[PDB]
Design a protein around this ligand. Structure first.
Ligand SMILES: [Cl-]
Ligand SMILES: [Cl-]
Ligand SMILES: [Cl-]
Ligand SMILES: [Cl-]
Ligand SMILES: [Cl-]
Ligand SMILES: [Cl-]
Lengths: 174, 174, 174, 174, 174, 174
């Protein structure tokens, strides 16, 4: 069949395609989050920029998976990409909570694929995830948790003031 | 009559002169807004600077219209310039609300002139407005709406604190 | 309702959201085309690079439309993104034919939206499309037609040789 | 028929070819004007240079139209180019009057083609003319009218002195 | 009342507002003069540039007065700005005569305000006018008188030739 | 009659005007050849560029002849410029064959004019042609013959492949 394929299971090939779908879904979710915060009636530039940057980061993860699929001799298969779970994302707090939920779901999918690779004795796959995905996800989730704690401490009894200050003094703007 | 005039209606010529009056009136309004915020009993430098910059921008729009009037062979006609609608402009919120009202009025005058040009089959006029006025106005109104949303979120129950923070962390000063 | 919206119809707002979907669908189609040509059993780097660049270009078009939607006071609404029409794209000729069909479809959607804007007397919309989309599309379709003619002249009776030479001597690589 | 042609009428295609003929005729007229002023018995270098520069400018307009014809999928068709209307061009005043008449005729042809494009719902054509021809023509006609006024004010009762001074102090020489 | 106001009479405050009106009226007069000389049927670039520069200079004088009003604790009050005294300004000579009349009127208003300040024992006001207005006005009136003498010497029996030569060899152009 | 004319026959003056017509006709032929090869259904950039460069070169020859006519005291006389002999130019081979035929015709006209100058004892004319035209034409015809031989050797039994390779590997592009 394939001239280069070696030690690459059909199970891993399919899970890789599924993970591409998840990362592209996540990228699309972040595009929607970013543009919501650019609305004139939301207007939080640093929050917009944060999520637009994450849309690109998730796309780059999908791109790396597609490069790897071909390096291994599998075949990329694309599926429909479902729209994000919400049209309007509420407050910065609500948005950051949704993002952490999204990231935990990508992380579990990475861990599930790592376990499949381990079970199939596919060390290239396992190394690929360890080298380019697992620590990146851990670092991002830590950042998001740090942000959640700071957003929550700023709510107090003046939510608008806190949401403005977080965007201006923590998030980068521009 | 004119050695260069071609496809330039008397209706457009007159509307151009009227629009110069509107832009100069707007420039004068912004001069008054700017100096109000420089009062020792208002003292919001970033707000002053914002409006003084807009006084210059509106003047430059009037200047471009006057250059174009001559390029087309029409004759600039100047009228009395009415004073701004207020002597004192209230809070930054009140001022930004007045500015958005002013900008919507200039925008409608641009759109009305574009429609006249379209009706008169004057594509140079229509292009001129599209290339140097329509998008500039859209961008400015979006900026002003973003500012309004941020000012409103900062009012809460501590209006002075919010007005200070907006001027310091959003408006340019320095 | 909206503090900035002016001369922006619900019909244009909805068509803009539909056009974002079309551009993102096109971007996804080009991602699939690009990775197909990176397969070890296809291996045409310049063709891969051509289509991956177009995936980014179509994404940037969607991004510009989303920025504009917000500048005008409309609300971005995202829908499901359908998968590309094919999983395997055949020869470079077949792929370039599919791309020209795709581009003609985006072009017609641009022209349809321009006509709606003209009918609604929305010159900002019309200018936006003229300034950032119509000529870009015309230039791209011309390029693709030039490529089709060169690919076709190279088929003769030695198709593989011609497909290699086109990728090496016309398309940028590496 | 054509693999790239879309929304491009036969009427516009033919009018574009006609406009190429007009621009090349105008270029040839300016070549003749330029060399007349280089005659030893006329010897007005700045006037020669002015018209030779315009010969190139009109050629570049024809070249842009030909590029566009191909970008749109139309076919350039060339016709005989008629010689200029005069062999000898009189005074600088006579020449500048002939040039303004020529430019008004090109301008009307641009406006006529714009109107045809508008009628045919061809916004690429209309934008192309607005972006690269309408304002260039308006600016040139204004310049020529400014020159005519200065030449006329210099005639008085010493025509030769005035013609020399205009060439030396207004026209560029080197 | 005011937290900073000291030794600043209501009479000076009001006269300062009146002088702002005069300077803005003068600025508007110079804008009209400048654009008249940019007409295709007048076409004297150096004269246009001279008056457009003076429009800016008079605006800057108004701006300095407004800054000072606030520095002293007075309140800027803006009034309607009357249109210039003429729609068409005749020859360069006629225009320069009107400008010298205008400048003498601003100068007398400066001297009147200086005398009021002296009478009110307001040395800051008097110094402000001496340091930023009195000598600037004297220098400008001298320049304008030098220009008038040169324009008059050039009229002789060839007015157009003289008006051209003055614009080309004295006034700055490009 | 002429203050500078010396040793310049009416026969040479007229032949110079005729040669200007021939060079401009040739320039127009090359403009048509160039744009034919820019058609989306021909698409040979290096061939387009080759002929567009020759259109400019032939124009420059006409310009040099016109400069010389005036240097000698003759009078440039322009005639109608006939359209090129074909609307469509076939293959690169067909086009290069037509160009060599065109160049041989210009060369014979140069040689005929040189012989007239020799007969009229006009050494300035003869030197002018020797210094700026005869060797330029010989070099160009040699280049074109070298191109013809290479195009012919590439036809074999795969004409499209050969036409592509010639354009990519010999003609400058990209
Ligand atoms: Cl499906
Ligand atoms: Cl009045
Ligand atoms: Cl759904
Ligand atoms: Cl014919
Ligand atoms: Cl009033
Ligand atoms: Cl004839």
């Amino acid at each position: 069949s394939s001239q280069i394929r070696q030690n690459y299971s059909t199970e891993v090939e399919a899970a890789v395609n599924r993970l591409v779908n998840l990362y592209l879904r996540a990228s699309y979710t972040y595009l929607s989050l970013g543009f919501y915060f650019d609305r004139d009636d939301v207007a939080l530039e640093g929050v917009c920029h944060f999520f637009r940057e994450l849309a690109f980061e998730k796309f780059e993860g999908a791109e790396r998976l597609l490069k790897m699929q071909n390096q291994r001799g599998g075949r990329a298969l694309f599926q429909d990409l479902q729209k994000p779970s919400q049209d309007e994302w509420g407050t910065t707090l609500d948005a950051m909570k949704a993002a952490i939920v999204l990231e935990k779901s990508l992380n579990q999918a990475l861990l599930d694929l790592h376990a499949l690779g381990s079970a199939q004795a596919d060390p290239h796959l396992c190394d690929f995830l360890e080298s380019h995905f697992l620590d990146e996800e851990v670092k991002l989730i830590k950042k998001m948790g740090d942000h959640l704690t700071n957003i929550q401490r700023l709510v107090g009894s003046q939510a608008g003031l806190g949401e403005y200050l977080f965007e201006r003094l923590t998030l980068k703007h521009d």
